[PDB]
Design a protein around this nucleic acid. Structure first.
Ligand SMILES: [Mg+2]
Length: 208
DNA sequence: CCCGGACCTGTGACAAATTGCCCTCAGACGG
DNA sequence: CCGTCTGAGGGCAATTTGTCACAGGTCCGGG
């Protein structure tokens, strides 16, 4: 299946995208990399990749696309994703205008096969699997320590998850569970503390 | 000695949002 | 021209995600 690659600067960038928008984003990166910034999406091709009907595909593309307006990307400098609205010349076909200034940030890199992520539902969990891959070894294992405040900024978790028990229950446990249930990776963790405060989360993983 | 207060934890409610489903009906194409 | 495959619309209830009040732990410094 298609092998996604992206600069680590994008993996660690700050942004908020839905699953459907992130799903579309993978195809843009695939299209762009296999070469001005003008990409295209066919309804019927999208449907076959993610096992959806044409109708629900159409609904997902259409609503994702109009929700891009005003979205911005921060590299620690802010940029908009799109500089022109989407439009359909033909039935079943969409044409999109990615900000050409994003190109160099697209192409010290991260890689994963698309089948690894296409069953994930929660977008924050898609971002965690993208951030673990950045440190993965050939054989398929790795271990990395991420700071909680940096997790909150980079993934832009909503504000009420600054209370740690809500963070645990509605983000961490759920996203660890899906990965273990929906990917070929087996993930565990432990909490790092300083006094009463939890400061980092330590992830360990292996393949198969 | 024990207090109220500033911290920490997990859970129960409810509100807002998202999931995969369903139904209708005209466009684009080829038989 | 019509019968069929698409896909652009309109909806639903069942789940997930996002928010906050309240009980219950600790340690500190004042009474
Ligand atoms: Mg959907």
């Amino acid at each position: 299946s298609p092998r996604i690659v992206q600069s680590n600067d994008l993996t660690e960038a700050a942004y908020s995208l839905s699953r459907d928008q992130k799903r579309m984003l993978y195809l843009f990166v695939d299209q762009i990399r296999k070469s001005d910034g003008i990409c295209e999406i066919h309804v019927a091709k999208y449907a076959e990749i993610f096992g959806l009907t044409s109708a629900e595909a159409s609904k997902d593309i259409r609503q994702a696309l109009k929700s891009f307006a005003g979205k911005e990307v921060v590299f620690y400098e802010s940029f908009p994703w799109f500089i022109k609205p989407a439009h359909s010349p033909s039935r079943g076909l969409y044409s999109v205008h990615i900000n050409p200034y994003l190109i160099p940030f697209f192409i010290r890199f991260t890689q994963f096969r698309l089948s690894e992520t296409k069953e994930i539902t929660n977008p924050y969990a898609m971002r965690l699997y993208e951030s673990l891959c950045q440190y993965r070894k050939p054989d398929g294992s790795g271990i990395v320590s991420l700071k909680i405040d940096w997790i909150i900024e980079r993934y832009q978790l909503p504000q009420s998850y600054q209370r740690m028990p809500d963070f645990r229950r509605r983000f961490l446990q759920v996203c660890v569970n899906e990965i273990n249930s929906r990917t070929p990776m087996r993930l565990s963790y432990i909490e790092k503390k300083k006094g009463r405060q939890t400061t980092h989360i330590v992830f360990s993983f292996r393949d198969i």
